[PDB]
Amino acid sequence: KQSSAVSTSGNLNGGIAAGSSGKGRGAKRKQQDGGTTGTTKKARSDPLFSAQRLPPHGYPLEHPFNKDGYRYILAEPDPHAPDPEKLELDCWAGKPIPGDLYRACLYERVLLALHDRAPQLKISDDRLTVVGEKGYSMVRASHGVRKGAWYFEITVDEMPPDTAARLGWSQPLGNLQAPLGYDKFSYSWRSKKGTKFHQSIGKHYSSGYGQGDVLGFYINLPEDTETAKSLPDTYKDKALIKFKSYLYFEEKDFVDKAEKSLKQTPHSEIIFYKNGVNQGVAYKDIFEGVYFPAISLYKSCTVSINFGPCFKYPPKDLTYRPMSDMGWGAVVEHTLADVLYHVETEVDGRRSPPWEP
DNA sequence: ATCGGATGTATATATCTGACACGTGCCTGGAGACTAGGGAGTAATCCCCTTGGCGGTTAAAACGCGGGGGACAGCGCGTACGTGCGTTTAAGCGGTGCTAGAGCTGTCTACGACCAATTGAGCGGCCTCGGCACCGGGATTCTCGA
């Protein structure tokens, strides 16, 4: 309400368009020894310190979850995107590409991302179950599908009568306080009777659900060709912030789409299984945009997502991919995204192979 | 009110050990058994202190009633005291060495223990009377407004 000037918080200011290329002037270059963060190349220890795990569900206490179309991710220093070699005779040959950052994820495996949960959403990493207290809420996994066919599961550990979880997929723009299907960008199942919920509309084109159901979830979206028919460029936003005691990265998320025309992604579908037994097709009409597996809680619902290598009734398809596979695929993809952005800003020129892949 | 840095503190680790849990052979206090006396326990009696009540009095308590006096809150300053860092200093380890004095045993003896015979120092009880307590009144001195 003042002017096109300094950011809304004096805690950290990013370089405005008039202060272009202003890197986040957060912590000073003068660091303390510390000792705990003095890991070297000879030691074998994961620098991403996961919090203490507790059998009772807990809350991430100092994480400002996504809002206003503003995505929030973990940050690590990464003082140099590694390009160190011998001192070449030409002192103007190589570029260090000092991004001084990375999207390192606080996860041993592809799990339910804590960055995209509601403040009323509790997790227990003993089974990575998710639970709530009042009404409905939504959580999502770490990964997100953009093409191909894949598959995961949800295991339900507690379903009292006043406890009805919902399980399915949701694109970004999905308000994580809504019950996973209240908008047109989410398609789920209600875990009282198998009922497909989308646009808050319930449809009985489905089988029946059981209290101890280990439910399999198969979903096939077309390649990014039929998804976009154009450039699927991924120019990323990256902003450095130093929240109360830790460094984090902000990126710009998508905006609420007013899409009211139906253009289904070609040959995309969703299939639901009960313990591998085909519960049937859920949604053939699938809108564009990346999707991610999501779970909605009612009052005190206990469910958990699960990947493929520890499966119970897996499909024997050679094309579908477990949660972990697409997870590390997207992780490596965002690594290359950081690489390319630091290249763009740091070294003149860019170049990519024969487009098709 | 927050964050960053400094610093101080709780933790895991490793090993060293010397207290310490453990077991012995040997000692004597504890148990076991037996005898006596007599402290203690019971009971009937007496006394007599206490606990109870009753009526009259007022000094005392209840209660009220200003109101000056200080409890208290605040406010300035400043001096004395925490602090961190200097400095130097005896404190502690430890180990040595001598023995003065605890600390033990073996007498033997004076010394109460104890009992018995004796009684007069002392104690309950009974007059008694004089400092003492009370009272009334006069004179003295503190105190609160000039």
Nucleotide whose C1' lies closest to the alpha carbon of residue A27 = B4
Q: Give resolution, Å, one decimal.
A: 6.2
Nucleotide whose C1' lies closest to the alpha carbon of residue A246 = B3
Nucleotide whose C1' lies closest to the alpha carbon of residue A33 = B5
Rounded to whole angstroms, the Cα distance separating A250 from A143 reads: 17
CA angle A200, A206, A207 (to 5 degrees): 130
Footprint of strand B on the protein (CB under 7 A): A 11, 27-28, 30-32, 242, 244-245
Asked if residue A167 lies in contact with residue A179, where contact means CB atoms within 8 angstroms, the answer is: no
Rounded to whole angstroms, the Cα distance separating A150 from A218 reads: 6
In chain A, DSSP assigns E strands to: 70-74, 121-124, 129-132, 137-140, 148-158, 166-170, 186-191, 194-198, 201-203, 214-221, 239-243, 246-252, 269-274, 277-283, 292-297, 302-306
Six token digits for residue A194? 């198998």
Six token digits for residue A322? 């477990």
Rounded to whole angstroms, the Cα distance separating A141 from A109 reads: 11
Rounded to whole angstroms, the Cα distance separating A50 from A273 reads: 33
Distance of CA A147 to the CA centre of its chain: 15
Q: Which ranges of A88-246 would DSSP assign to H, the alpha helix?
A: 224-228
Q: Which nucleotides of B are covered by protein (CB under 7 A)?
A: 2-6
Asked if residue A175 lies in contact with residue A68, where contact means CB atoms within 8 angstroms, the answer is: no
Label the pairing between strands A269-274 and A214-221.
antiparallel
SS3 content of chain A, % helix, strand, coil (to 5): 10, 25, 65
DSSP lists the bridge partners of residue A270 as A219, A283
**CA(A300)–C1'(B39) in Å?**
81
The residue among A175, A96, A104, A99 whose CA lies nearest residue A142 is A104
CB-based contacts of A333: which residues, under 8 Å, 6+ apart?
A: A234
**CA(A161)–C1'(B120) in Å?**
108
**CA(A50)–C1'(B6) in Å?**
27
CA end-to-end span of chain A: 46
Q: If you ran DSSP here, which 8-state letter would residue A93 be given?
A: S
Sign of the alpha-carbon torsion through A21, A24, A30, A31: negative
What is the torsion angle, in degrees rounded to the nearest 10, for the CA atoms of residue A259, residue A264, residue A269 and residue A270?
Answer: 10
